Symmetry: D3
Subunit: 329 residues, 6 copies
C-alpha cells in the first residue's frame, strides 16, 4: 500500500503499551518485511511472542543504554521507532540518574546506531510533559527531543531522517489512571484519589497515537516535532464517569506534577505551523540543507500560528464528555 | 564558616570562579582553595593573578570521574560552577552540553560522597525553570540530581543545594560587555532581539555573596533563589549607548521573551524570606527536613497559591542610571 | 538474624522477590528492605502492594556497578535473585544472559565488598550442574564467582554463599500456571515434551524458607541444596487436567530429560544433613573453614563415593493429589 | 591446493602450543598469503618470530579482552582461528573472573571484530571439559561455544561463518602431564603424582588436532561443533609407559577435575550426526537460513546417532596402548 | 590552485594560536570547501566564529579524549591537522596524567577516527621538546609522534597518510615570553625574569609554521617527521631588544626545562635527510610498502646527513639579531 | 623492613620478579608475597618452583584497574615491574606499550592510594633518560606519574619512588644469553651493531639488592640510580666467545650508541652518594622533603654544574674476565 512495504522496522520499548499496539497495527495494515522488538524484559518478550506468534516478528533482548547491543540490533533496519523510556514521574524524581541514562543516553545511543546502520527514517516518542517541563522526566524527554532534531545536521553516505512525535496522556495507559480507577471500583471501591479541581490533561487513544506516528512517517522530512490536535478533559468529569457511585478524597499532588500540560510553548509559536489535524514545531536551529516544513510529503499545506499562540490543555476548544470516555475500554 | 576548611570550585577559572576565589581569600580563613578546570592557559594566568600559597590548581574535566575522585580528597566544601552555558552552541552541540552539565553533575556528586564532602552548592540558572532550550534542560536535570543526592546517608553526611539566579551583569560573553565593545569602538548599530524583552539582573559580586550566604543556612536539598530586579532591554540600550540606533534583529535560537525564576506550578513548594526564596524538594528524604527555618534561624512563609516569579511581573526594576553604576 | 538489619534483594520485584519480602516483613525485625530492579512498572505496583515504610525501592540494573555501589550503602545482607532465566531466550540472546547473570554477579560481589556487607546469598539453579544450556552455564559461572569471593579479607568480612534448587511450583512463566491458563479456558491440547521427563519440585515458600535458614548457618562458600521431591511430568498432567489429551511435542532447546542437583563428579565435596546438602568449595581459602558443622551446630556426614542426586533416582516423589494442594 | 590459498589468516593465542603447530602447518602446506599471530606476550612473540622467521608472518601484540585492538587487527582478514584462552583448571577456579574475561568476553570481542571486518570463516577451539562441565574453565568454554554458534544468526553485507572444534587432552601439551612426567624421571624421579585408578581421558596429538581444524574449515557451513573420533587411555598405563622405574602416590584430586571427560552429552544426541572419522553437534537453535549439516562441503554424508548415545572417555572402543604413546615425543 | 581545493579540512585545537593562523591562511589562500574547528571551549569558539564569520567554517565542540565524538566529527573529512594539546611544561609536570590523556590518548583517538572515516592526509604538530625529552610534555609528544608514524603501517580500503611536523618556539606564542615581556614593560616593568645566560631556543614565526605545515601537505608521502631550518636566539639578546630600559633577575629554572632544545637527535641522524629549507626524519620502523623519502611529492631531492649530525639550538649557524625580533608584532 | 609485611610485585613472574621473590623469602620476614601477572603458565611453574605458603598468585593485568584494586587489598609494599620492554616490538606496537607501561602505572598508583599502601617502587630504565625510542618514552611518562603521585595526601600516606638502572647481565631475552645459545651450539657468526657501542651493566642480584636498599631510605619522590660499570660491546664479544668472527650488522631500531642514566639537563637535580645518585623531583610537593639525607641518615652532595652520567664517559668498566664471572 505504501512506504512501509518490504521494509524492516525496529521499535525500542516494543513490549510496552504503545509498542504492542504499534506492532499489531504494522502487521495488520502493512506489508512490512520484518518487525523487531527491542527491550530488556524476557518475561514480556516471551509472552508477547506467544500473543503475536507472527513469523514476521523478531525479538531482541537489549537495553537502549547499551550502544554495542543497539549497533548489532539495528543492522539491516530501514525504520526505527523509539518508544523505550522510564516515564513514571514520581519514580523519576526519586531515581533521576536512571531516568537520565535511559531517556537521554538512550536517545543518543539509538541515534548513533541508526546512523551507523544507515537507517532511513526515525521517529522518537515525546510527551507534552517535555514542553516547559517542571519534572525530571519531562526534562529528559526535552533533551531527547533536542538530540533527535539535531541529528538531522549529520550527513553520511546516507542521510537518515529523525523526527519527533509529541502527544499527551493515553486513555487508560499501561499505568494510567483509567486502568487504575477500574481496578478500584472492581475491587469494591469506596474512595477515589483526586489531586486538584481545575486540573486538565490532553487525551488521545492508543490507536490514534499509533496511527499518528505512522502518518507522520509518510509526511516527515526530518527534524519536525509532530503534535496532534486532541481534546482536553478536566479530571472532575473523569472520575464521575468512571466511578460515580464512590466518593473522592483530594489526595496530595504527586511530586513534580503540573496542573495543566503544555503542548506548544508560547515562546516557540514562531516555529509552529498549523495544519488541519496537527501542528509542526520546526527546528530552532538551521541545518545544512534546509527543508520546507510548510508542505508535508503528503502535499499538505500548513500556516504559521499566532505569535502569541500556546497549545495548553486549558485553552483548548475540544473537550470529551463523560460518554465517549466510557466508550474506551 | 570556611574557617580553615578546604574548598574546591569546578569551573574556577570562569567569571563566577575568579570572583568567588577573590572573596574567599579576602573574607574567610579557608586554608586551601582548589581550582578545578580544563584550560592550562587560564589556570596559568590565574595562578599569576592569584599568587597566593592558599591556592591550588588541578587541570581536570568534570566528565572525568576518576580525576574528580582524586581532586576532591580532603575537601570540605565544593562549589560546582563548571558548565557549557552558550545557548545557541548548546543547541548545535547538544550531547556536549549534556555530557558536561548532566554527567558532570553526576560525577561531582559521586566524588563528593566518596570523599565525604560536608557541603556542595551547584550553580543553576533561571533558564532551568520551564526551560525551552537544551542548555536550560540540562541544568534542570543537574538541579534534580543535586536535590536527589541528599537521600544518601553513608558514613559522613553530605549536603547538596542549588543556587539559581539570572543574567550576570556584564558576564563573560554577556551583552553589556558586548556593547561596551561597540560603544568604545566605531559603532553605529546596536543589535536587538525584541522590545518587550525582559531579564533578571544580578551582579557577579551579589552572586558570590548569595552563594556564601546559602552555605551558612543550607540544610541540603534547597534551590535558593535571590530576590533580584528585572530590566527591560529597551533600557539597557538607553543606558549603555543612548542617542544611538538599535536595529531589531529578532528572537534568537532557544531564547524566551521573559525568564522565570520560580514556576507557578511549583509555588506550593516555595517559601519566602526577606530577601530570597527557597524551592523545597519535590521528594521526601528518609531523613526529613524543615526548610521553614534556615540554619540562621531565619523564618520563611509559604507563598500565594498562584505565585509567579517572572522577569515581566517583578515588583522592582533597575534604573537606567543605576545600571551604569555597575558596568 | 535480621534483627534491625538492612537487607537488599536484586531482582526483588520477581516471584522469589515478592515472596521473600513478604516473609521478611512478617517474620523478622529487619529495619529496611531494599528492592533493586529495573522496571518502574513492577516497582510502582509492588510499592502499592507493600505499602510499608520499611520498604525502599531503587531502580537499577545489576550490570551497572556504580549504581550497585550506591544502592548497597548501609546494607547488611544482600540476596541476589536478579537474572535472565528463560532458557530458549538465553540461547537466542547469549551475550545478554552472560551480561546479566555473569557480569551481574561480579558487580554485586564488588559492591558488597566495597560496602562491607556481612552476608550474601546468590540464587542458583539445578540447571547449573553439568549444564548443557547457556542459561545453566552462566549460573555455574555465577556460582563459582560467589564461592571464590570468600577469599577476600579486607576491612569488614563478607560471606558469600549459594542456594541451589529446582523448578518452583507454578513460578512466573512456569508450566503449572501455563496449564491453569489452559484448563480455565477452552482448551483441548496439553503441550508435552517427553515421557520419561522428570524434575525436582519446590514451592516458592519453601525456597524463601530455605534461603532464610541458609543465612543463619552459613560460614560463606557453601552451595546449599535442599532435599526436595521429584515428579514425572506424566503425573503433573494427570493432576492439573486429567481426562484430557496431551500431544507429545518433544524436547525443547537446551533442555535435559532429568535435572541434576549434585553431580557425581562432586560427590566427594558433598556433605549430607537431615534435610539438605552442602557442596563444599573446590578451592582452599587462606582462612579455612569446617563445613561439617554449620553455625547452627548441625552435623553433616560425607556421602557415598558415587552419590548422584538426580531427578530420576530420587528417593521421594510428589503425589498427583498433594501436587494440587499447592497450585 | 585449496581454500586457504591467497587468504589472510589470523590466529588468537598463536604463540601457544596449538598456535605454533597450526601456523607451521599452514605455512608448510598452503599458499596462504599472510598469517597473523595475535597474543599478549612480547617474549613468546619475539622468540616465535625468530623460530619461524617467515616473511608471510605478522605479529600483533594484543589482548582478546580489548575489542578496539581486535577490530584493528582483524582488518583484511579472511579466516580467524580462535585459540586464545586461560585453560589451567585449578588456576581458573582461584581466578574465576580472569578466566571469564579472557574466555567469554574474549569470544564476544572476536565475534564482534570478525563481523565488523567481514571475515569469511571463523573456528573457535573448544574442549571436552565444556560438555556437562563441572569446573569454571569448562563453563566459560561452553559459554564461548554458545556465542560462536549463535553468531551465525547475524546477516550483514557478508555472512561470516562461525564453527567450533571440540576435542580432548593433547598428548604432551605445553603444560600437560606427559611433558611433566618426562621432566620428573629426567630430574631423577622417585615418585609420580596420580589421581584415581578408573581415571580416563581422550587423547589426540597436536598435529592431528591441527589437521582436524584445517579439515573442518573445508567442510563447515557454519554453526557446527566438530568432534573428532579419538581413542581413550586410562591414566594407569600412562604413568607405567612413561616411568615404569619409579612409584606413584595417589595425590589428591585437583580442584574441579572429573574422572571421565564427556565429548557428546547424552541430552544432545538428538542433535548429533555421525560420520566416518568425526561427529557434528548441530545448533540447539534455528537460524534464518537453515543448513543441511547432513552433507559437509566435502560431500561427506552423516547419519543421526542413537537417541541414547553419549561420547564419554570410558565407553569408547578405541584405546592407545603404552607403545604408541612413547612414539609421541 | 592546488591539493586543498574542494577539500574538507578539520583541525583539532583550532581555536589555539596555531589554529587561528592556520584557518585564516587556508581560507585566504585556498579553495577549501570546508574548515572544521574541533576544540572544547565554547568561549573561544563563539568569539572565533564572530572573528572569522566565514560560511565555510564549522565549529564542533569536542575533546580529543572522546573517541566517539571524534568519529562523528571526522565524517566526510579529507585532511586532518592535529594541533590540540596541553603544552605548558610546568603545568604538565604537576598534572602528568592530564597531559598524557590529551597528548597521547588524544593522538590515538584522532588516528582511530581518521582511519574509520578514510581521511586522506593527516599532519600532527610536534615540538623540539620531543627530541631526547626531559620533561613530561616532551615525552607525551614523542609518544604521539611515534603513534602517528606507526599508523602508516595500516592498510584499509583507503590508505590514510600520517606525517608529523616538528619545530621550536613560536615568536610571541599565545603564552610565550614575548607576549609576556611586552605586558610587563607596558604595565610599567622594573624587572624581567631570566633563567640562564647560555640559554638557547629555536625561533620561527606563527605564519612560517603555518606555511610549513601546508607545504608539508604537498610533499608528504606519509610517515615523515618534517623539520624546518630555523635560526637560533640566545635569551640574552631577547630581553634586551624587548625591554632594554629595565633590569632582569636570574629567576629559578622552571620545572623540566632544558638549556638548549634539540631538533634532530644525534642517534637519529642515520634516518635524517637534508633538503634546501628543511629536514626529514625517516621512520625507525619499516612498513609494508616502503616510500622513497629522498624525493618529495614536489620532486625535491634530499641527501643523507653526517652520521654524527645533530640539530641543536646552540650549534646552529642562523641567528636572529635583536632587530628583526622587534619587527615581529 | 618487610618484617611481617605484605608485598606485591606486578610482573612477578619475570626475571626481576623471580629473583626478587627469592631474596625476600630468604632474607626477610615478609608474611606474604603476592605475584600479580597475566600468564597462567609461568605462574603455575613459579608456584611449583616456589612451593612456599607465604606465596600468593593473582592472575591479573596492570591495564585492569578493578583487578588491581582487589589484588592490592592489605598490601604494605608494592614493587611495580610489569612492562613491555622489547624496544623493536614497542616500535611496531606503540599503543600496546603505552597501555601497559603508562596506563599500567596510572592504575597501579590509583590502586595503591586506594588500598593505602605504604611504599611503592617502580622500575625504570636508562632508556627513559633523553629517550629516542617509544619504550623509553613510556617509561619516562611512567616515572613522572610515580614521582607526581607523591602530592596526594589522603588518609594513609603513600610514598612512590623509582629505581633506574641499565642492561641486566644475561636478562630474559638479553644478548649474553643469546650468545651463550650460539656458543654452546654450532655457530660461526656473532651479530654486532656498532663498534663504539657501550652500555651500563648490573646483575639481576644487584638490581634486587638496590631495590631493597631503596625501600629502606626512600622518602618518596626519588629516582634512585646505582653507580654501575660500563662495558664496550667490543669486549662482551672477546669474552662470551673469543677467537670467533663477528659481523657488523649495524644499528637497530630506536637504539642509541650510548645510554644515559642522569641527563646533563637534570644534573642540578642530582645528589651524589657513596654508591648511588638521587634525581630529585622537578616539582614542589605541598609537603616538602630533604633528599640530602636519606632515611638511613646518609648524606648526599650536589653534583658538578655539567655532570653527565653516561655509558661512554663512565669512570669504571667491567673486565672481560670478571664479565664471565657472572654469566
Ligand atoms: N524461576 C524458577 O523456576 C527458578 C528455579 C530455580 C532457581 N531459580 C532462581 O531464583 C532466582 C529468581 O527467580 P525468579 O523466578 O524470582 O525470577 P523472576 O520472576 O524472573 O524475577 C527476576 C527478576 O530479576 C530482575 N532483573 C532481571 N534482569 C535484571 C538486571 N539486569 N538488573 C536488575 N534486575 C534484573 C527482574 O525485575 P525487573 O524486570 O524490574 O529488572 C525480574 O523480576 C533466579 O536467579 C534463579 O537462580 C528460579
Ligand atoms: O600432577 C598430576 C596432574 C595431573 N594428573 C592426571 O593427568 C591427567 C591430565 O592432567 P593435565 O594437567 O595434563 O590435563 P587436564 O586434564 O587438567 O587438562 C588428569 O586426568 C589428571 O588426573 C596426574 O596424575 N598428576
Amino acid at each position: 500500500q505504501n512506504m512501509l512495504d518490504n521494509q524492516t522496522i525496529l521499535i525500542t520499548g516494543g513490549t510496552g503499551s504503545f509498542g504492542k499496539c504499534f506492532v499489531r497495527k504494522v502487521l495488520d495494515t502493512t506489508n512490512a518485511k520484518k518487525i523487531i522488538v527491542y527491550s530488556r524484559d524476557e518475561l514480556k518478550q516471551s509472552e508477547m511472542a506467544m500473543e503475536f506468534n507472527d513469523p514476521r516478528m523478531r525479538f531482541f533482548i537489549g537495553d537502549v543504554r547499551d550502544l554495542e547491543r543497539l549497533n548489532y540490533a539495528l543492522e539491516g533496519v530501514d525504520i526505527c521507532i523509539h518508544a523505550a523510556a522510564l516515564k513514571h514521574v514520581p519514580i523519576a524524581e526519586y531515581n533521576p540518574l536512571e531516568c537520565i541514562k535511559t531517556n537521554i543516553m538512550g536517545a543518543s545511543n539509538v541515534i548513533n546506531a541508526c546512523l551507523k546502520n544507515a537507517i532511513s527514517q526515525v521517529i522518537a516518542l515525546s510527551t507534552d510533559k517535555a514542553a516547559n517541563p517542571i519534572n525530571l522526566y519531562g526534562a529528559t524527554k526535552l533533551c531527547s527531543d533536542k538530540l533527535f532534531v539535531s541529528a538531522n545536521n549529520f550527513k553520511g553516505s546516507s542521510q537518515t531522517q529523525f523526527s519527533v512525535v509529541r502527544y499527551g496522556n493515553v486513555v487508560g495507559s499501561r499505568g494510567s489512571v483509567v486502568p487504575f480507577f477500574k481496578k478500584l471500583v472492581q475491587n469494591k471501591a469506596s474512595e477515589i484519589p483526586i489531586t486538584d479541581i481545575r486540573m486538565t490533561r490532553f487525551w488521545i487513544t492508543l490507536d490514534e497515537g499509533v496511527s499518528f506516528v505512522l502518518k507522520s512517517l509518510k509526511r516527515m522530512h526530518g527534524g519536525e516535532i509532530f503534535v496532534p490536535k486532541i481534546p482536553s478533559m478536566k479530571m472532575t468529569d473523569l472520575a464521575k464517569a468512571l466511578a460515580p457511585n464512590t466518593p473522592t478524597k483530594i489526595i496530595g499532588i504527586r511530586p513534580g506534577e503540573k496542573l495543566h500540560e503544555v503542548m506548544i510553548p508560547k515562546d516557540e509559536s514562531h516555529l509552529a505551523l498549523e495544519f488541519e489535524d496537527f501542528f509542526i514545531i520546526q527546528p530552532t536551529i538551521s541545518f545544512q540543507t534546509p527543508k520546507d516544513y510548510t508542505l508535508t510529503k503528503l502535499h499538505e499545506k500548513g500556516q504559521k500560528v499566532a505569535p502569541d499562540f500556546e497549545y495548553s490543555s486549558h485553552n483548548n476548544n475540544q473537550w470529551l464528555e463523560p460518554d465517549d470516555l466510557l466508550k474506551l475500554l
